[PDB]
Amino acid sequence: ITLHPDDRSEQTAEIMRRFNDVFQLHDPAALPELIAEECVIENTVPAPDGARHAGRQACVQLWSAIATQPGTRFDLEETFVAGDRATIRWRYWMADGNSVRGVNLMRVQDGRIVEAMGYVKG
Amino acid sequence: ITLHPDDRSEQTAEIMRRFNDVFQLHDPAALPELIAEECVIENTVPAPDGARHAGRQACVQLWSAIATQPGTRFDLEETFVAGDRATIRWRYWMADGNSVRGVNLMRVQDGRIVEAMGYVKG
Ligand SMILES: [Cl-]
Ligand SMILES: [Cl-]
Numbered sequence: 001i002t003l004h005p006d007d008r009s010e011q012t013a014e015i016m017r018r019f020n021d022v023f024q025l026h027d028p029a030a031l032p033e034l035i036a037e038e039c040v041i042e043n044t045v046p047a048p049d050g051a052r053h054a055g056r057q058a059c060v061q062l063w064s065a066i067a068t069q070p071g072t073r074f075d076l077e078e079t080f081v082a083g084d085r086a087t088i089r090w091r092y093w094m095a096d097g098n099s100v101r102g103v104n105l106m107r108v109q110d111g112r113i114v115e116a117m118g119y120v121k122g
Numbered sequence: 123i124t125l126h127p128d129d130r131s132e133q134t135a136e137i138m139r140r141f142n143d144v145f146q147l148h149d150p151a152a153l154p155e156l157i158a159e160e161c162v163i164e165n166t167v168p169a170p171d172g173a174r175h176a177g178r179q180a181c182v183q184l185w186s187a188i189a190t191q192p193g194t195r196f197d198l199e200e201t202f203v204a205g206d207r208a209t210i211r212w213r214y215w216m217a218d219g220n221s222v223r224g225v226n227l228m229r230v231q232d233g234r235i236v237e238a239m240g241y242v243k244g
Contacts, residue, residue: 048213119243121241122167122241
């Protein structure tokens with residue numbers, strides 16, 4: 001985690017560590033405590049806009065499925081934190097052996113993830 | 123521009139304003155002075171990795187063409203700055219009338235853009 005010094009930067013880093021570990025450990029147990037009631041994900045697909053998932057339940061369900069899909073994984077390229085925001089660059093490996101690079105733009109409020117926006121190479 | 127308070131945040135905001143104006147005004151005159159000799163762009167396409175453009179000349183050429191392509195434009199969604207980094211969310215409108223949302227991750231060093239990473243909805 002690259003930290004830009006800022007009031008809550010260390011808190012946001014801790015949130016991103018635990019968030020990233022869900023995927024690295026394929027273990028979604030931490031997801032609910034990290035996600036705001038009103039959390040929104042703007043997913044990577046489909047263009048033009050990306051789907052939208054709203055509310056803790058939808059966000060937990062989506063990320064849980066992602067974290068536990070057989071034959072898939074993520075390599076973390078860089079997590080950069082500043083204040084209540086972070087960027088997480090990654091490479092996603094698919095069950096067919098292909099991969100794609102992407103990024104999440106993350107925002108926290110009251111110590112929980114309220115916004116996650118995903119993008120990919122197209 | 124949303125600024126996260128940090129040493130050079132105001133400088134980075136100024137760089138991003140002038141960078142964004144190149145596209146909004148379809149005027150690439152400012153590009154060279156904003157771009158480091160060694161600047162690298164990791165473009166939005168093609169998956170998996172995105173092409174790579176290296177050096178001021180390549181980066182100026184690519185962005186100049188983008189800025190001046192007839193029938194195309196960008197809407198700025200949000201520019202967020204922290205320290206020597208920024209994120210710029212946008213919607214790109216293509217000559218065929220379609221659009222796609224995307225984001226640039228930007229990094230400056232010595233007052234010039236050294237790194238620009240682009241991603242899109244897929
Ligand atoms: Cl990678
Ligand atoms: Cl938009």
